[PDB]
CSV table of C-alpha atoms in Angstrom, one decimal:
chain,number,residue,atom,x,y,z
A,1,UNK,CA,-0.1,0.0,0.0
A,2,UNK,CA,1.1,3.6,-0.8
A,3,UNK,CA,-0.6,6.1,1.6
A,4,UNK,CA,-0.9,9.9,1.1
A,5,UNK,CA,-2.2,12.5,3.5
A,6,UNK,CA,-3.3,15.7,1.8
A,7,UNK,CA,-3.2,18.8,4.1
A,8,UNK,CA,-5.3,21.4,2.3
A,9,UNK,CA,-8.0,23.6,3.4
A,10,UNK,CA,-9.3,24.1,-0.2
A,11,UNK,CA,-11.7,21.2,-0.1
A,12,UNK,CA,-12.6,21.3,-3.8
A,13,UNK,CA,-8.9,21.1,-4.8
A,14,UNK,CA,-8.2,18.5,-2.2
A,15,UNK,CA,-11.0,16.3,-3.6
A,16,UNK,CA,-9.7,16.5,-7.1
A,17,UNK,CA,-6.2,15.7,-6.1
A,18,UNK,CA,-7.4,12.8,-4.0
A,19,UNK,CA,-9.4,11.4,-6.8
A,20,UNK,CA,-6.5,11.6,-9.2
A,21,UNK,CA,-4.2,9.8,-6.8
A,22,UNK,CA,-6.8,7.2,-5.9
A,23,UNK,CA,-7.4,6.4,-9.6
A,24,UNK,CA,-3.7,5.6,-9.8
A,25,UNK,CA,-3.9,3.2,-6.9
A,26,UNK,CA,-2.8,5.3,-3.9
A,27,UNK,CA,-4.6,5.2,-0.7
A,28,UNK,CA,-5.4,8.9,0.3
A,29,UNK,CA,-6.7,10.7,3.4
A,30,UNK,CA,-7.4,14.5,3.7
A,31,UNK,CA,-7.3,17.0,6.5
A,32,UNK,CA,-8.1,20.6,6.5
A,33,UNK,CA,-6.8,20.9,10.1
A,34,UNK,CA,-3.2,22.2,9.8
A,35,UNK,CA,-2.7,22.5,13.6
A,36,UNK,CA,-3.6,18.8,14.1
A,37,UNK,CA,-1.7,17.5,11.0
A,38,UNK,CA,1.7,16.8,12.7
A,39,UNK,CA,0.3,14.5,15.3
A,40,UNK,CA,-2.1,13.0,12.8
A,41,UNK,CA,1.0,12.1,10.7
A,42,UNK,CA,2.8,10.7,13.8
A,43,UNK,CA,-0.1,8.4,14.7
A,44,UNK,CA,-1.2,7.4,11.2
A,45,UNK,CA,2.0,7.5,9.2
A,46,UNK,CA,1.6,8.1,5.5
A,47,UNK,CA,4.2,7.4,2.9
A,48,UNK,CA,4.0,11.0,1.6
A,49,UNK,CA,2.3,14.3,2.5
A,50,UNK,CA,0.9,16.7,0.0
A,51,UNK,CA,1.0,20.0,2.0
A,52,UNK,CA,-0.7,23.3,1.0
A,53,UNK,CA,1.1,26.6,1.8
A,54,UNK,CA,-2.1,28.4,2.2
A,55,UNK,CA,-3.9,27.0,5.1
A,56,UNK,CA,-6.9,28.3,6.9
A,57,UNK,CA,-6.6,29.8,10.4
A,58,UNK,CA,-3.3,31.6,9.9
A,59,UNK,CA,-1.4,28.4,9.5
A,60,UNK,CA,1.2,28.0,6.8
A,61,UNK,CA,2.3,24.9,5.2
A,62,UNK,CA,5.9,25.8,5.2
A,63,UNK,CA,5.8,26.0,9.0
A,64,UNK,CA,4.1,22.6,9.2
A,65,UNK,CA,6.7,21.3,6.9
A,66,UNK,CA,9.5,22.7,9.1
A,67,UNK,CA,7.9,20.9,12.2
A,68,UNK,CA,7.9,17.7,10.3
A,69,UNK,CA,11.4,18.0,8.9
A,70,UNK,CA,12.8,19.0,12.3
A,71,UNK,CA,11.4,15.9,14.0
A,72,UNK,CA,13.8,13.0,13.7
A,73,UNK,CA,11.1,10.4,13.6
A,74,UNK,CA,9.0,12.2,11.0
A,75,UNK,CA,11.5,13.9,8.8
A,76,UNK,CA,11.9,10.9,6.5
A,77,UNK,CA,8.3,11.2,5.3
A,78,UNK,CA,8.5,12.9,1.8
A,79,UNK,CA,6.6,16.2,1.5
A,80,UNK,CA,5.4,17.9,-1.7
A,81,UNK,CA,4.4,21.5,-1.1
A,82,UNK,CA,1.7,22.9,-3.2
A,83,UNK,CA,1.5,26.7,-3.5
A,84,UNK,CA,2.7,29.8,-5.2
A,85,UNK,CA,6.1,29.2,-6.7
A,86,UNK,CA,7.4,32.5,-5.7
A,87,UNK,CA,8.2,30.9,-2.3
A,88,UNK,CA,9.9,27.8,-3.5
A,89,UNK,CA,13.5,29.1,-3.9
A,90,UNK,CA,13.5,30.7,-0.5
A,91,UNK,CA,12.2,27.5,1.0
A,92,UNK,CA,15.1,25.5,-0.6
A,93,UNK,CA,17.5,27.7,1.6
A,94,UNK,CA,16.1,26.3,4.9
A,95,UNK,CA,17.8,23.4,6.8
A,96,UNK,CA,14.4,21.7,7.2
A,97,UNK,CA,12.5,21.8,3.9
A,98,UNK,CA,10.1,19.9,1.7
A,99,UNK,CA,11.4,17.4,-0.6
A,100,UNK,CA,9.6,19.0,-3.6
A,101,UNK,CA,7.2,21.8,-4.4
A,102,UNK,CA,4.6,22.0,-7.1
A,103,UNK,CA,2.9,25.2,-8.4
A,104,UNK,CA,-0.7,26.1,-7.9
A,105,UNK,CA,-2.8,26.0,-9.9
A,106,UNK,CA,-2.0,22.3,-9.5
A,107,UNK,CA,-1.5,20.2,-12.6
A,108,UNK,CA,-3.0,17.0,-11.1
A,109,UNK,CA,-1.3,14.6,-13.5
A,110,UNK,CA,2.1,16.2,-12.7
A,111,UNK,CA,1.4,15.8,-9.0
A,112,UNK,CA,0.6,12.2,-9.5
A,113,UNK,CA,3.9,11.7,-11.4
A,114,UNK,CA,5.8,13.3,-8.6
A,115,UNK,CA,4.1,11.0,-6.0
A,116,UNK,CA,5.1,8.0,-8.0
A,117,UNK,CA,8.7,9.3,-8.4
A,118,UNK,CA,9.0,9.9,-4.7
A,119,UNK,CA,7.4,6.7,-3.1
A,120,UNK,CA,6.8,4.4,-6.1
A,121,UNK,CA,3.6,3.7,-7.9
A,122,UNK,CA,1.6,1.1,-6.0
């Protein structure tokens, strides 16, 4: 099994991305709750996280990414950020950063290809 968690408060986008990944054979869960996502990942470990920058409630995805990538037990989980590419180069400068980053508006097919490249197609 290849398990993905989508952390995204845009529920329409999340459903489309979930469906594309599911069609390709991934198991996918979704959460809009950025605050709860790190502990959700700890207790229900996915193979990959798709993480939006623009989260509701003043959260941002690069911060959630940093929390994951600073945790020695969770840092090995690959993360694909989805958001405005104007932030991607700066994020590459951090010690703790996402494995990859894909622009919004998201090309769903390309996101699926990156998932497969990162964790294997199931």
